[PDB]
Amino acid sequence: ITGTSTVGVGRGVLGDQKNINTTYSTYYYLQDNTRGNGIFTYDAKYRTTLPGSLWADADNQFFASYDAPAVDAHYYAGVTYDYYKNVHNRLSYDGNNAAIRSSVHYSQGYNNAFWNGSQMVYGDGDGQTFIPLSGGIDVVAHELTHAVTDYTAGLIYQNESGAINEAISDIFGTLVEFYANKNPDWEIGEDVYTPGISGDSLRSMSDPAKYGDPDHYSKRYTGTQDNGGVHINSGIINKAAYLISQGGTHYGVSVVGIGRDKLGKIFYRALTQYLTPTSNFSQLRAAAVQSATDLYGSTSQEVASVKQAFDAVGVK
Numbered sequence: 520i521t522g523t524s525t526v527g528v529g530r531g532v533l534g535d536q537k538n539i540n541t542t543y544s545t546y547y548y549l550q551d552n553t554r555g556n557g558i559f560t561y562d563a564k565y566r567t568t569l570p571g572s573l574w575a576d577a578d579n580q581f582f583a584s585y586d587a588p589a590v591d592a593h594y595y596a597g598v599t600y601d602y603y604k605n606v607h608n609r610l611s612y613d614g615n616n617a618a619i620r621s622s623v624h625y626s627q628g629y630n631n632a633f634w635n636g637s638q639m640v641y642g643d644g645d646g647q648t649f650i651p652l653s654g655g656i657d658v659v660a661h662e663l664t665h666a667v668t669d670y671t672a673g674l675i676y677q678n679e680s681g682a683i684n685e686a687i688s689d690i691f692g693t694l695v696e697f698y699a700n701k702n703p704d705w706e707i708g709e710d711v712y713t714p715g716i717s718g719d720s721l722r723s724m725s726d727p728a729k730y731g732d733p734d735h736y737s738k739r740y741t742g743t744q745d746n747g748g749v750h751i752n753s754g755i756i757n758k759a760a761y762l763i764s765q766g767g768t769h770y771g772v773s774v775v776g777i778g779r780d781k782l783g784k785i786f787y788r789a790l791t792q793y794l795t796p797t798s799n800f801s802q803l804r805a806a807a808v809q810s811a812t813d814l815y816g817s818t819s820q821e822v823a824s825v826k827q828a829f830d831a832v833g834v835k
């Protein structure tokens with residue numbers, strides 16, 4: 520809506536206070552005009568009709584329990600925008616500063632979050648498996664990264680291309696978490712997953728097998744559940760990404776780590792220049808090798824490490 524840019528203050532899902540960019544016109548709206556063509560956050564009001572209503576608040580203070588998921592969806596969308604712009608020179612998910620829209624309070628007891636083709640959507644969780652999912656910066660960045668993927672590589676959401684799609688969202692979700700630098704790790708969703716259990720997470724990139732996901736191509740899921748295992752086989756690529764960044768010896772194969780910034784550069788370039796909607800794991804390896812070659816040279820350590828990492832997870 521048309522109005523003037525303002526700065527509100529509120530508390531997120533985990534009880535942390537933060538400033539948020541808002542817009543004043545009669546009400547204060549969760550509309551951040553400081554980034555691209557805006558970041559807009561909506562109330563889905565426990566319904567499934569989207570987007571719901573643009574979040575309106577009387578006083579620009581967002582400390583109510585009901586406000587918390589909105590505060591975090593809005594704020595972490597801003598951090599994710601900043602990551603893509605500052606680190607990769609990418610302006611929003613389409614590269615042209617498309618408005619970023621999110622809805623919170625989607626459905627009832629909803630243990631998931633998603634990109635629906637046009638916007639981000641966050642459940643509140645059931646309080647057992649999840650608390651409101653926008654409380655995780657890696658989750659928010661995971662969702663916005665689906666939009667980036669859809670506008671670029673266009674990876675079809677099934678089988679190997681879908682597992683790459685998932686891994687790309689976990690990788691950049693994690694790199695955004697490191698960018699913000701608050702309790703960063705190589706785990707996925709730990710801040711909002713299972714409030715009754717400390718120290719777990721939905722997935723692990725450093726050790727996918729800890730939560731049942733394969734860490735080697737020979738252990739890939741070949742069934743039909745989960746669109747052919749997109750959230751399962753992502754572990755194979757997540758592990759390769761982890762190894763490229765941090766190094767390690769995995770199934771006897773040693774990888775020299777090159778750090779998270781170079782991981783990000785290599786995978787961003789692969790995603791935006793080389794991957795196609797039907798890319799499989801072998802084709803991702805080739806894309807990553809080519810990207811590292813473009814950036815660092817064919818004889819580089821970076822290229823050598825990409826090859827070792829994919830070798831370690833059994834992808835040729």
Ligand SMILES: CC(C)C[C@H](NP(=O)(O)CNC(=O)OCc1ccccc1)C(=O)NCCC(C)(C)C
Pocket residue numbers: 630631632633634635636652657658661662665676707708721750
């Ligand atoms: C990062 C986590 C917290 C959320 C993450 N959500 P996601 O974006 O991968 C779910 N998305 C999804 O299924 O998209 C498919 C889709 C396409 C088009 C329109 C609508 C939906 C996830 O791993 N979901 C799976 C969760 C489960 C079922 C394993 C608990």
Ligand SMILES: [Ca+2]
Pocket residue numbers: 576577578579580581582
């Ligand atoms: Ca208020």
Ligand SMILES: [Ca+2]
Pocket residue numbers: 696701702703704709710
């Ligand atoms: Ca963390």
Ligand SMILES: [Ca+2]
Pocket residue numbers: 657693696703704705706707708709
């Ligand atoms: Ca994390």
Ligand SMILES: [Ca+2]
Pocket residue numbers: 709712713714715716717718719720
């Ligand atoms: Ca937990």
Ligand SMILES: [Zn+2]
Pocket residue numbers: 661665685688
């Ligand atoms: Zn996903």
